C-alpha cells in the first residue's frame, strides 16, 4: 500500500472499524464479523519436528433460515482475493488454494462428500487444498431446538464439528426493540441505497484487501513467557 | 392511450377492484386469489445497488386446497393471458428439464450450454401443477431461482451464470387428499420451513358445501354451460373498455356493472408494468409498525394457527405487494391504502382458524 492509506487504517479503535467494515449492511453480529476478519487474516503455518500444523481458520455458521447467512457468504466471496462460492448440490477445493472456500447448504449434502471433506479439513490435502473452509448449515426442522442436542440439530458427526475451529449460532429470537431497530435500518437501506450512518464510514474493499494481503506477509513468533 | 388515461382518471380507486373482479368471469369467487394473480401480472420492482447486490422483485404464491375448486382453470387462464408462460407439471420435468445443462458437442469437441425451462422463461410466469408430487431435489433446484433468480453452472472446461428472474405459480393437493379441518395446517401442507418461507403468499381453499354457495356455483356453471357463442346456429357441431353485456355470461342482476375487455386489460397491464413507483416515508413507518405487530402476534395468536412462519422475507413481501398495488393504479407515490391492501392480504393468507 501507500503508507498514508495504512495510517488511514490505523486510527483509534481500528480493530472495531475493520470488524464493522465487513458486511456493514447487516446490523449487529460483530462477533461473527471479527471471526470472518480473523479467517481473512489467518494463522501461521509451521512444520516442526516432522509434522505439519495448519494456520487456516475454518468456521461453521449455522442458524435458522433468514438470518442473512447467504449475503454474508456473498460479501466474503467478493472481498476475499481467492474465493470460491459453491452450494451443496451444485458441487472447487483445489481452485480455492491459498484462499477461502465459501460453501452453503452444508447440511443439505450427502455424507459421501462429507467423508472426503474430513481429509481436506485435517491435512489441507486431497494435491494441496490449503484453503479456509467457511460452511453454512441449517436446522433439520427449520428452527433450532435448544431442547435437542447440538449434533442432532446439526445432523453432522461430532468429529466434523470439532474439526471446525469456530462455531457460531445465530437464533431468530423475537425482541420488540431489536425488531424495530432492524426494521428501521432495513428501511433506510432500501430507501437510501446506502448503509445507515454509523460512527465511522467503512473502508473500501480494495483497501481492506491490500491491508489483509500485507498483514498476511508477517510471521509472528510466539514468546515462551 | 386516451381511453387508458380516461379510465384511470375516472376510476381512481376502482382500477384494482375492477381488474380483479373482471379477471375471470368464468370462475366464481376467490377474490383474494384474483388479487394475487393481478399483483403477479403487475409485478414488483427490481433494484440494483452500488455494491452490485441483487434484490428479487418477483412474487411466489402456492395454492393448496381440495379438488374441484377451480384451481387448474386459473392456471390455464394465466397461461393463456401471460406473454411468457411455460407450464411444467410435477413429474413432467425433472431438475435437468428445469435447470440448464451442459452437453459436449461431438462435432467440435467443445462444451455448450443448453437453456432449461426456467432460463427461457425470463420475466414471465411458470405454472406448476401437482407441486406436492414433485421431489425434494427439484425443490432445492428451484430454491436458487426463487431466492436470487439465477442459475450457476460449472462443468470442467466452462463456467457461466444465467439469469432466472421469474415468478412461479404452484398448485398442490393435501397429503390426505382432502384438507383436514381439525388437523393443523402444518400437517396438511407437509412442506419444509425453507420452502414455505421462500414462498411469498400461501392460500388455502376449502370446498365448503353451504346451501347458498352450492346454489350459486351450480347456477353459474349451468349458465356458462347453456351459453352459446353468437353467430353460430343452434345444435351445430364443432376495442371498448367495457365488455358487451350478455344475459347469460353476466345476468340480469349484473346489468349494473360491466367487465373489462381482455385486450384493453392486457394493454393497461403492460402500461402499468412499465410504470416505476417510488416509496414514500409515510408508508414506511406504518409498514414497519405493522410488521412489528405481526412478529409480536405470536403472543396474540389466540386459538388461530399460522400457515407459514414469519421471517425477514415477509417485510420484502409487504414492500413488493405494496409496489404491485401502486402499479395497479397509475401514480408515482405510495399511499396508506396501498400498504393497507397488502396488509389485509397478508392477514387473510397467513392466519387461519
Curated annotation (Swiss-Prot), chain A:
PTMs per UniProt: O-glycosylated (O-GlcNAcylated), in a cell cycle-dependent manner.
GO biological process, one term: cellular response to epidermal growth factor stimulus
Region annotation (Interaction with RAD17) ranges: 170-213
Cellular component GO terms, alphabetical: chromatin; chromosome, telomeric region; CMG complex; MCM complex; membrane; nucleoplasm; nucleus
Residues the record lists as binding ATP 1: 27, 66, 68-70, 138
Subunit structure: Component of the MCM2-7 complex. The complex forms a toroidal hexameric ring with the proposed subunit order MCM2-MCM6-MCM4-MCM7-MCM3-MCM5. Component of the CMG helicase complex, a hexameric ring of related MCM2-7 subunits stabilized by CDC45 and the tetrameric GINS complex. Interacts with the ATR-ATRIP complex and with RAD17. Interacts with TIPIN. Interacts with MCMBP. Interacts with ANKRD17. Component of the replisome complex composed of at least DONSON, MCM2, MCM7, PCNA and TICRR.
Protein name as annotated: DNA replication licensing factor MCM7
Organism: Homo sapiens
Residues of the full protein shown: 319 to 576 of 719
Curated annotation (Swiss-Prot), chain B:
Disulfide bonds: none
Localization terms from the record: Nucleus; Chromosome
Protein origin, superkingdom: Eukaryota
Modification comment: Acetylated by MCM3AP.
Residues the record lists as Phosphoserine modifications: 308
Role according to the record: Acts as a component of the MCM2-7 complex (MCM complex) which is the replicative helicase essential for 'once per cell cycle' DNA replication initiation and elongation in eukaryotic cells. Core component of CDC45-MCM-GINS (CMG) helicase, the molecular machine that unwinds template DNA during replication, and around which the replisome is built.
Name this protein carries in UniProt: DNA replication licensing factor MCM3
Originating organism: Homo sapiens
Protein encoded by which gene: MCM3
Span within the parent record: 281 to 656 of 808
Amino acid at each position: 500500500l501507500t503508507r498514508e492509506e495504512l495510517r488511514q487504517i490505523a486510527e483509534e479503535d481500528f480493530y472495531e472499524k475493520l470488524a464493522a467494515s465487513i458486511a456493514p449492511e447487516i446490523y449487529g453480529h460483530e462477533d461473527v464479523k471479527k471471526a470472518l476478519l480473523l479467517l481473512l487474516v489467518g494463522g501461521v503455518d509451521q512444520s516442526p519436528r516432522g509434522m505439519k500444523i495448519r494456520g487456516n481458520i475454518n468456521i461453521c455458521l449455522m442458524g435458522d433460515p433468514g438470518v442473512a447467512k447467504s449475503q454474508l457468504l456473498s460479501y466474503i466471496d467478493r472481498l476475499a482475493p481467492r474465493s470460491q462460492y459453491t452450494t451443496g448440490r451444485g458441487s472447487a477445493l483445489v481452485l480455492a488454494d491459498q484462499g477461502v472456500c465459501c460453501i452453503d447448504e452444508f447440511d443439505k449434502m450427502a455424507e459421501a462428500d462429507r467423508t472426503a471433506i474430513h481429509e481436506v479439513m485435517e491435512q489441507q490435502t486431497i494435491l494441496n487444498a490449503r484453503c479456509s473452509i467457511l460452511a453454512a448449515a441449517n436446522p433439520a426442522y427449520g428452527r433450532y431446538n435448544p431442547r435437542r442436542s447440538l449434533e442432532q440439530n446439526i445432523q453432522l458427526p461430532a468429529a466434523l464439528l470439532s474439526r471446525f475451529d469456530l462455531l457460531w449460532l445465530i437464533q431468530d429470537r423475537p425482541d420488540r426493540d431489536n425488531d424495530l431497530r432492524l426494521a428501521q435500518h432495513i428501511t433506510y437501506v432500501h430507501q437510501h441505497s446506502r448503509q445507515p450512518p454509523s460512527q465511522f464510514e467503512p473502508l473500501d474493499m480494495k483497501l481492506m484487501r491490500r491491508y489483509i494481503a500485507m498483514c498476511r506477509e508477517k510471521q509472528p513468533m510466539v514468546p515462551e513467557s | 392511450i386516451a381511453k387508458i388515461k380516461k379510465f384511470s382518471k375516472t376510476r381512481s380507486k376502482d382500477i384494482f377492484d375492477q381488474l380483479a373482479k373482471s379477471l375471470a368471469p368464468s370462475i366464481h369467487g376467490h377474490d383474494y386469489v384474483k388479487k394475487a394473480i393481478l399483483c403477479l401480472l403487475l409485478g414488483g420492482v427490481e433494484r440494483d445497488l452500488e455494491n452490485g447486490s441483487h434484490i428479487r422483485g418477483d412474487i411466489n404464491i402456492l395454492l393448496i386446497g381440495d379438488p374441484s375448486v377451480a384451481k387448474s382453470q386459473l392456471l390455464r387462464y394465466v397461461l393463456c393471458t401471460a406473454p411468457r408462460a411455460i407450464p411444467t407439471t410435477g413429474r413432467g420435468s425433472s431438475g435437468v428439464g428445469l435447470t440448464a445443462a451442459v452437453t459436449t458437442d461431438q462435432e467440435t469437441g467443445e462444451r455448450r450450454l443448453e437453456a432449461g425451462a426456467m432460463v427461457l422463461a425470463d420475466r414471465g410466469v411458470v405454472c406448476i401443477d401437482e407441486f406436492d408430487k414433485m421431489s425434494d431435489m427439484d425443490r432445492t433446484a428451484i430454491h436458487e431461482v426463487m431466492e436470487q433468480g439465477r442459475v450457476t453452472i460449472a462443468k470442467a472446461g466452462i463456467h457461466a451464470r444465467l439469469n432466472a428472474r421469474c415468478s412461479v405459480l404452484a398448485a398442490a393437493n393435501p397429503v390426505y387428499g382432502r384438507y383436514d379441518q381439525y388437523k393443523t395446517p402444518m400437517e396438511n401442507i407437509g412442506l419444509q420451513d425453507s420452502l414455505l418461507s421462500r414462498f411469498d403468499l400461501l392460500f388455502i381453499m376449502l370446498d365448503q358445501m353451504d346451501p347458498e354457495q352450492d346454489r350459486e356455483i351450480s347456477d353459474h356453471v349451468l349458465r356458462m354451460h347453456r351459453y352459446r357463442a353468437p353467430g353460430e346456429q343452434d345444435g351445430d357441431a364443432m376495442t371498448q373498455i367495457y365488455e358487451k353485456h350478455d344475459n347469460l355470461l353476466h345476468g340480469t342482476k349484473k346489468k349494473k356493472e360491466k367487465m373489462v375487455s381482455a385486450a384493453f386489460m392486457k394493454k393497461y397491464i403492460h402500461v402499468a408494468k412499465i410504470i416505476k413507483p417510488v416509496l414514500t416515508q409515510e408508508s414506511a413507518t406504518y409498514i414497519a409498525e405493522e410488521y412489528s405487530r405481526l412478529r409480536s402476534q405470536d403472543s396474540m395468536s389466540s386459538d388461530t394457527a399460522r400457515t407459514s412462519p414469519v421471517t425477514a422475507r415477509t417485510l420484502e413481501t409487504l414492500i413488493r405487494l405494496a409496489t404491485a398495488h401502486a402499479k395497479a393504479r397509475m401514480s408515482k407515490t405510495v399511499d396508506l391504502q396501498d400498504a393497507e391492501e397488502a396488509v389485509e392480504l397478508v392477514q387473510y393468507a397467513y392466519f387461519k382458524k
